[model samples]
Target: EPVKYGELVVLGYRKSRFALYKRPKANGVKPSTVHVISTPQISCKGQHSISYTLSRNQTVVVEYTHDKDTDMFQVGRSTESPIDFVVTDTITQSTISRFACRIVCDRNEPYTARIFAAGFDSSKNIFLGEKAAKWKNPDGHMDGLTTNGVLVMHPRGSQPGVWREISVCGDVYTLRETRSAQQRGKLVESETNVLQDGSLIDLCGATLLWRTADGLFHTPTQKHIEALRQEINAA
Candidate 1:
């Protein structure tokens, strides 16, 4: 657990940064729009590319660099190396994204953690397919939603909690009517992707409870649960 930053409890049980990432340069060459008659041959492996497939078979590849200021971990159904935490759905079984989502934490104090929609595959590529909902901002940056999405709910201070969808770009949005609808919901400018002490993440097939490092100290361990069980049995 040396690399463990926090725990993603899958409702049933079991456990498991931001900044430093450079934003897309504003003055870069506009993303070229090209139509591939057939499937264009592309690199299948090697360096990681935050690939975004736009309409008409065009892909905009973004390269990333090492972030000395943060640490990142991935959660998914696949037992792949990229997925730091493996989650299996005992219910519907296959609805979880193989590389569902990623949690990035600040390496230093405050240890802030945030969640993003999709994670990188074995090839180190994080792809937003052409059919997926995607758009280019006026500033020439690109972002898209994953097929099934990563939704989060922060418990209301004393009221009903609201669920919001998170994007790969780490922006918050109102929930779409369907899981992977072509249309995305309205952006929630006031909210953020930061994970609080009791945030709940719903990855379509499964749900996770995010527990912070300090919060875990107050959580009942197996020993505590056993103690309660024994006391109950004695009665």
Candidate 2:
């Protein structure tokens, strides 16, 4: 199947909308800079495997597994911490998977964090849904695409040293940074806790709008994306 590209949008209950911005090459214009709203909430620990129910029986693979052991975590040290891993399926021999990690606190205390899988390749550049084009300025200068998701970057973005826990929330979904922080605060029922810089991120389900290099916005349907997802799994 031909690779389909464009803006990506995911909608859920409570009128929550998540949008991802496409790169300028796919869209004619620059993208917007989306701020992450709150820290992610991880419900389970240890290696958890997931396969696409709609895919052609393809198995999704998460490489570089990290748990309480390995270099991923410290012994007897717990705080706000981020983990990283490569995401892929056994079907695709040439590509790997990419994912981000956020550790939420257990007793509402500070946690250690880190960005893993920073320097890995999945062969195909993972798309967080749609790519849109937007002008950095009203006159259009300095343009780029944006996604309502997280990209594991090199050089680390957290403090030099600290411990943190992983927090994952499933009730709400959106890309609003401030809104996410507010929601996270309410979820924890703590007015003092806040979503730190480079701490807030959306793991999945977001909407993205962008202008392609041709100066056109290509809207991709969920069905079309589902087909691609299946294809990737089937490989």
Candidate 3:
């Protein structure tokens, strides 16, 4: 069996929504296995979207729109993949315009995957859902951490080492810095530790917005864009 191994210098969660990337080992090398699907995005632009891949015999039903028509969504399914693999698929359901896909792996599961999309809208695409995210994709239940029903993000305006963790089971929220589990503060409550629509977090650096009318989580934006620019350079 693969014995105890490495560590990651995490680039903490940023963006209102980001894909679940399949991380390589700390050494910056990936083991030989199924390749990762870089969906390029997690939000949709009207009438356009995408999803995770499907191995042979794995079937999926998609609800999309051809644009410029009734309700603007067409619910459909893939035929059959007799080969080893197919392209990415969808992530959710429900909606009048275009709903995300619901891809159920038929047989063997993958290390990690993200169902993404685009072109659903040109100027005004949509993005909202109870998201599921995890670090270190593993099903022997080996992932370092797993978060569900919440979209993870950070203050692009905050310091580079910032780390945040919110417990779905509890109201507790943990903020850390750098590689340590060192807590930046007490276990703050998510319910009461609120952020307003126009209020700014990251010490007047990043501003939070209720990006979607139905979205409850405060999405940090309009600040710290330089943080992302710094990362793309290193990567």
**Which of the numbered candidates is closest to the native, going by highest TM-score?**
1
What digit string (tens of lDDT, one per residue) describes model 3 on residues 78-184? 22321111122222542211212211111112221111111122322223222322222222211111111111233343333233333221122454433123222
Model 2: residues with Cα > 4 Å off, grouped in runs: 1-84, 87-133, 138-145, 150-198, 205-235
Predicted structure 3: lDDT: 0.24
* True-structure Cα RMSD, model 1: 8.4
Model 2 TM-score relative to the real fold: 0.18
Which parts of model 1 have CA positions greater than 4 angstroms off? 1-4, 13-45, 90-93, 218-235
- Flag clash pairs in model 1: 7-16, 17-104, 17-105
Error of 2 at 113 (Å): 9.2
lDDT of each: 0.67, 0.22, 0.24
Report RMSD (Å) for each prediction in the order shown: 8.4, 23.0, 19.9
Q: How many pairs collide in each candidate, listed in order?
A: 3, 68, 19
TM-score of 1: 0.77
Residue-by-residue lDDT tens digits, candidate 2, 90-190? 22132221333222212211222222211211231111211221122344322212222232111123222221212221112222344223221112122
Question: Compared with the true structure, what per-residue lDDT tens digits does model 1 show for residues 94-157?
Answer: 7988999888777666677889888878887777676787777665677778888898877652
Which of the two, 2 or 3, has more TM-score? 3
RMSD of 2: 23.0
Better of 1 and 2 by TM-score: 1
